[PDB]
C-alpha cells in the first residue's frame, strides 16, 4: 500500500501537516465545555438555520457511549470517523472488561488515534479537535479536549474551533469552580456568545449529569439566551 511519509519535521522543528490540521480546526464551528459540581455542559454553534436543512433534529454533539458525549471542531467527515472509532472502542472495552470505559480512558484512546494519524505513513492527520465530557461509573464529572497532534488535556472549561483562544481568555476571567446545572448552562452560552453570532438559533447545547444526558429544547434555551444577552448589555454599559 501507499506508505509515503506525509507528516514530517521541517527545519524549525514544526510538523507542518499537524499545524495545518489545526488550521482546519480554527476554521471549524466553535464548541465549548463547562464542568460544574454535578454537571458537564457541552455547547456548539450550528452553521445557522437554513430553511432547507431537514426540520427533523440532527445533534452536533455526538454520543460515544451512554456516559460519554463529544463535540468536535474541524472536518465533519474526519470527526465522524473518530467518533465511529471512539464508539467502537467504548463497546470493544465493555466486551473485554465488563465495566463501562471511563471518559479519561476513551479520551486517551481518541488522542492516541489522532497521534497515530500524525505518524502513520500514507495518512494526513485528522483535522479535528474534540471536546469529550461525561461521568465515570463512580460519579466524577470529566471534561477533556483532544487536538489534532493527539495531545489531550482535562479542563474546568474549554473551547475549540473558531476564536477558541478568545473564548478561553474570556472564560478563565469569569469561570468559578463550584457551579449549578443552571449556572454552567448560563456560563457555556455566555462563553459561546463571545464569538458566535448574536442569534440564539445557532447555539445547540447538551447538559450531562450522572446517568442523565439532556439537550436543551430551543424553548428552554431562548430563556437562558435572553437572560445572558441582557447580562452582555450590562457588561457593554460598564465599558
Amino acid at each position: 500500500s501507499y506508505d509515503r511519509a506525509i507528516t514530517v519535521f521541517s527545519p524549525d522543528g514544526h510538523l507542518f501537516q499537524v499545524e495545518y490540521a489545526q488550521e482546519a480546526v480554527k476554521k471549524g464551528l466553535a464548541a465549548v465545555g463547562v464542568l460544574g459540581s454535578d454537571s458537564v455542559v457541552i455547547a456548539v454553534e450550528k452553521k445557522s438555520a437554513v430553511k432547507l436543512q431537514d426540520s427533523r433534529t440532527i445533534r452536533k454533539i455526538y454520543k460515544v457511549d451512554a456516559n460519554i458525549y463529544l463535540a468536535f471542531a474541524g472536518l465533519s467527515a474526519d470527526a465522524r470517523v473518530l467518533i465511529n472509532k471512539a464508539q467502537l472502542e467504548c463497546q470493544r472495552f465493555s466486551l473485554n472488561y465488563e465495566d463501562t470505559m471511563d471518559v479519561d480512558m476513551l479520551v486517551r484512546y481518541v488522542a492516541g488515534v489522532q497521534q497515530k494519524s500524525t505518524q502513520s505513513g500514507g495518512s494526513r492527520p485528522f483535522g479535528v479537535a474534540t471536546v469529550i465530557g461525561g461521568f465515570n461509573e463512580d460519579g466524577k464529572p470529566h471534561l477533556w479536549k483532544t487536538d489534532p497532534s493527539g495531545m489531550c488535556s482535562a479542563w474546568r472549561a474549554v473551547a475549540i474551533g473558531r476564536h477558541d483562544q478568545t473564548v478561553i481568555e474570556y472564560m478563565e476571567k469569569s469561570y468559578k469552580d463550584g457551579m449549578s446545572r443552571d449556572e454552567c448552562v448560563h456560563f457555556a452560552i455566555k462563553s459561546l456568545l463571545e464569538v458566535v453570532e448574536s442569534g440564539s438559533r445557532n447555539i445547540e447545547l447538551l447538559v450531562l449529569q450522572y446517568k442523565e444526558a439532556r439537550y436543551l429544547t430551543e424553548e428552554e434555551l431562548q430563556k437562558f439566551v435572553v437572560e445572558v444577552e441582557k447580562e452582555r448589555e450590562e457588561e457593554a454599559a460598564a465599558k
Partner: protein, 202 residues
C-alpha cells in the same frame, strides 16, 4: 487441589491446600495456590499448576498495566473478565485451570470463579479442585453472611482441612487469606496434620 473462597459481611475469605499431585505421586506439599495479583486482588490456582501460574501472572501484568495507564486500580469485574477472555480464547487448547479472582474495588468485595472454558461466575461462595466436593459439605453447612472474621477463617480453614483429610489430591498446608477494604492479609498458614490434632484432640 482444594481451594475455597466466600464473601461475608467482613469481606472475602480465601483458603487453599498446598499439594500438587499427578494423581498418584505427590510432586509437592508446598505449592502456593493463592497468587497475590496486586495488593487488593487474589487469584487461586487449581487444575494445571503451570496453566494457572502462567495465566494468573499474565492477569497480574494486565492489572498492573491497567494501574499505570489509567492511574487507578483495576476492578475485580475487569480483572476476572481479562482472565475469562484468555481462558475463552484458549477454550479448545486443553487448558486445565479453575480459578477464583477475589478482590475489593470501588464497588466493595467481589468474588468470581473463572474456568478453563471461559466461564466467569460471580457468586458469594465457591470451592474449586478435586477436594471441592469435600470442602463444600463443611463450608455450606457452616456458612452464614454474619460470621465474624475469626469464625469465617475458622470455617474456611476447617473446610479446607476436611478436604485435605479425604481428597488424595489435596493436602499439606491450609493457608487462609482475608480480603477487606484495606486489601488482603494472610491470616494463617497451618499444617493440616496439626489441624487434625487441633480439631480432634483425642
Amino acid at each position: 487441589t482444594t481451594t475455597l473462597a466466600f464473601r461475608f459481611n467482613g469481606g472475602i475469605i480465601v483458603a487453599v491446600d498446598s499439594r500438587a499431585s499427578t494423581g498418584q505421586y505427590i510432586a509437592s506439599q508446598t505449592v502456593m495456590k493463592v497468587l497475590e495479583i496486586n495488593d487488593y486482588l487474589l487469584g487461586t490456582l487449581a487444575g494445571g499448576a503451570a496453566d494457572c501460574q502462567y495465566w494468573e501472572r499474565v492477569l497480574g501484568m494486565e492489572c498492573r498495566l491497567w494501574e499505570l495507564r489509567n492511574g487507578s486500580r483495576i476492578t475485580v469485574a475487569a480483572a476476572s473478565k481479562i482472565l475469562a477472555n484468555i481462558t475463552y480464547a484458549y477454550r479448545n487448547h486443553g487448558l486445565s485451570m479453575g480459578t477464583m479472582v477475589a478482590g475489593w474495588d470501588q464497588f466493595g468485595p467481589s468474588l468470581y470463579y473463572v474456568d478453563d472454558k471461559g466461564s466467569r461466575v460471580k457468586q458469594d461462595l465457591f470451592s474449586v479442585g478435586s477436594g471441592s466436593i469435600y470442602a463444600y459439605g463443611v463450608l455450606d453447612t457452616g456458612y452464614r453472611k454474619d460470621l465474624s472474621v475469626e469464625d469465617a477463617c475458622d470455617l474456611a480453614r476447617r473446610s479446607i482441612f476436611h478436604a485435605t483429610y479425604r481428597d488424595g489430591a489435596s493436602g499439606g498446608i491450609v493457608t487462609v487469606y482475608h480480603v477487606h477494604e484495606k486489601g488482603w492479609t494472610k491470616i494463617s498458614r497451618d499444617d493440616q496434620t496439626k489441624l487434625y490434632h487441633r480439631y480432634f484432640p483425642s
